[PDB]
């Protein structure tokens, strides 16, 4: 029962989704959530937001600049490394490296090229950037090292107090490492198919497997005495608006159309007459909605809830896409993996009626008729249905997999955003004409493709950030330019 390792491990865990409310608000409530189609901003006082594409630097820089992310990560990695090397015990540092990848994947996925390999002990980013490809190559190398070490020490354990993800269970850490490896492999499957295949198939071939049961979901079980940060953030200003962040129209439209029994687990009911679940539209004129925010459905969440990093459902949907779209050898069939993912999701949230849900070949995502009468979407959403069809086209299979993966990944907005950019699925609603404050830079139908680099970097690391933009980014440093694995 050591404070120093314990404190370090928790610090590392916090660099994924921070326990600091305002940091988590920025990374996941105001950025990930809306860009991934789960959340919608709901504070009339915000004249500049990420969702409206006119965000100021203090909103966009957080992943790359916040002390609670990179500086904290590398400072604490160094501590755990010392402990491992000075107690001749490689387990703690191997687990720390897995958390490193979980944290920094979100960072590169937000900006594209980033400092990574050249970040020294001190955690400073005043050094040359890596290409996003080099970053991903290092991720794979790092995960493989951790997997090898932990598998050699599969019967070892961390103390429970040093691990509120898995209570020091080394085998679950290996499963998460293989699972994360599969996520990142599929991430690069369009741009780097041979590498993706090798990493995807390697993950599934490992003797300890992936996250296959909800009992092994990667969630940070840190809260109860300390409040869940997402809880506090989305509940801010509750009395006036119902909350600073509401569930998005998109997710609720899909789930309403499918009569999805998971809705009761995701959302609180709206105050709009006749409509149990109503989401708030993203990329809208916020000032006009001041008086109406409070009527929409809200995020169902408790101050003691764990924070999700990755679930068993996603792993099934990854294997489904790996086989069906990319032709990788996943030791199974797409039809099985798709249904297993949906079943795992229903079970995760305690919803019943999955059989009828999986048999539904006629229900489609619902229209968005705005009960406030301000942001009604005049067109139809996708006609993609639930029931697996083996004879369907590749495009339909991919839309089917990603749509269900997306629903099942509530509320992992950053992951949903990455999948939306890689695949184009699910078919998210566009920003409105008034809500797109990009001055023409952002296409309302495509949304934000990345965050711009921090102004701090142009000031203090000028030559290096300019190299990244001129040599690695393949476009201007704005929200319209796609990242490497998303380039079409």
- Does residue 389 bind a second copy (CB under 8 A)? no
Closer CB to a second copy, 341 or 430, in the complex: 341
Compute the least distance from the CB of residue 6 to a second copy, in Å. 23
Q: Is 331 in the site for a second copy (CB under 8 A)?
A: yes
Q: Which structure tokens are listed for 454?
A: 């921090």
If one asks whether residue 213 binds a second copy (CB under 8 A), the answer comes out as yes
Is residue 348 a contact point for a second copy (CB under 8 A)? no
171 binds a second copy (CB under 8 A): yes
Look at residue 67 and give the partner it binds from Zn ion, a second copy, none, a contact being a CB closer than 5 to 8 Å depending on partner kind. Zn ion
In the numeric block, which tokens belong to residue 12? 């590392």
Name the residue nearer to a second copy (CB basis): 162 or 204.
204
Tokens (6 digits) for 475: 């476009």
Residue closer to Zn ion, measured from CB, 138 or 441: 138
Sole binder of a second copy in the list 127, 138, 159, 208 (CB under 8 A): 208
Can you read off the two tokens belonging to residue 373?
């009468």
Region from 72-80, 89-97, 200-208, 222-230 binding a second copy, contact rule CB under 8 A: 200-208
CB of 58 to Zn ion, least distance (A): 14
Beta pairing partners, 41 = 245
In the complex, the smallest distance separating the C-beta of residue 201 from Zn ion, rounded to whole angstroms, is 14
Residue 39 gets which letter from DSSP? Answer: E
CB 103 within 8 A of CB 69: yes
Residue 2 binding: pick among a second copy, Zn ion, none (C-beta 5-8 Å cut-off by kind):
Zn ion
Q: Can you read off the two tokens belonging to residue 277?
A: 């679940």
Q: What are phi and psi of 206, to 5 degrees?
A: -70, 140
Per rule CB under 8 A, is residue 356 in the interface with a second copy? no
| The pair of three-digit structure tokens given for residue 48, joined into one six-digit string | 């500049």
**Contacts made by residues 451-455, CB under 8 angstroms, sequence distance 24+:** 451/31, 451/50, 451/60, 451/61, 451/63, 451/110, 451/111, 451/479, 452/60, 452/477, 452/478, 452/479, 453/64, 453/111, 453/477, 454/57, 454/60, 454/61, 454/64, 454/65, 455/57, 455/61
**Is 212 an interacting residue with respect to a second copy (CB under 8 A)?**
yes
Q: Applying CB under 8 A, which part among 10-18, 77-85, 199-207, 237-245 lies near a second copy?
A: 199-207
Closer CB to a second copy, 31 or 203, in the complex: 203
Minimum CB distance to Zn ion smaller for 3 or for 393: 3
Q: Is residue 332 within 8 Å of 395, Cβ to Cβ?
A: no
* Cis peptide bond N-terminal to 426, omega within 30: yes
Which residues are at the interface with a second copy (CB under 8 A)? 171, 175, 204-209, 212-213, 215-216, 329-333, 336, 339-340
């Amino acid at each position: 029962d050591d404070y120093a390792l314990g404190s370090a491990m928790s610090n590392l865990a916090s660099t994924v989704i921070s326990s600091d409310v305002n940091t988590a608000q920025f990374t996941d409530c105001l950025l990930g959530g809306p860009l991934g189609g789960y959340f919608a901003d709901s504070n009339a006082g915000w004249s500049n937001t990420i969702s409206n594409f006119n965000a100021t630097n203090d909103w966009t820089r957080v992943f790359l600049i916040s002390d609670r992310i990179i500086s904290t990560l590398y400072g604490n990695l160094s501590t755990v490394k010392q402990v491992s090397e000075n107690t001749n015990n490689p387990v703690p540092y191997a687990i720390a490296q897995i958390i490193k990848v979980a944290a920094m994947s979100r960072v590169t996925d937000a900006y594209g090229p980033i400092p990574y390999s050249k970040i020294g002990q001190d955690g400073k980013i005043t050094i040359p950037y890596d290409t996003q490809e080099e970053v991903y190559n290092a991720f794979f190398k790092e995960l493989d090292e951790s997997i090898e070490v932990l598998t050699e020490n599969r019967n070892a354990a961390l103390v429970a107090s040093a691990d509120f993800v898995y209570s020091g269970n080394v085998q679950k850490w290996v499963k998460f490492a293989n699972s994360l490896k599969l996520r990142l492999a599929i991430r690069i499957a369009n741009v780097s198919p041979a590498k993706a295949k090798e990493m995807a198939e390697s993950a599934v071939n490992h003797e300890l497997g992936l996250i296959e049961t909800n009992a092994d979901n990667a969630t940070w079980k840190y809260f109860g005495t300390i409040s869940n940060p997402l809880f506090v953030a989305v509940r801010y200003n509750e009395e006036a608006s119902g909350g600073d962040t509401h569930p998005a129209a998109d997710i609720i439209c899909y789930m309403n159309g499918y009569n999805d029994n998971r809705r009761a687990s995701y959302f609180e009911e709206s105050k709009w007459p006749g409509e149990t679940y109503v989401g708030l539209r993203r990329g809208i004129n916020l000032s006009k909605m001041k008086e109406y925010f409070i009527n929409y459905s809200r995020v169902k969440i408790s101050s003691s809830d764990p924070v999700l990093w990755m679930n068993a459902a996603e792993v099934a949907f990854l294997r489904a896409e790996a086989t069906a779209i990319y032709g990788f050898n996943m030791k199974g069939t797409a039809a099985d993996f798709y249904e297993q993912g949906v079943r795992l999701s229903f079970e995760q949230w305690g919803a019943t009626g999955v059989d009828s849900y999986l048999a539904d070949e006629s229900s489609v995502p619902a229209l968005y008729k705005d009960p406030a009468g301000l942001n009604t979407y005049e067109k139809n959403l996708s006609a993609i249905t639930v029931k697996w069809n083996e004879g369907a086209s590749k495009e339909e299979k991919q839309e089917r997999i990603i749509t269900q993966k997306w629903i099942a990944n509530w509320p992992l907005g950053n992951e949903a955003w990455a999948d939306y950019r890689r695949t184009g699925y699910p078919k998210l609603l566009p920003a409105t004409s008034e809500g797109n404050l990009s001055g023409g830079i952002v296409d309302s139908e495509k949304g934000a493709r990345r965050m711009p680099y921090p102004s701090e970097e142009y000031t203090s690391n000028t030559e290096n950030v300019q190299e990244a933009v001129n040599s690695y980014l393949g476009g201007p440093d704005n929200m319209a330019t796609d990242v490497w694995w998303a380039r079409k």
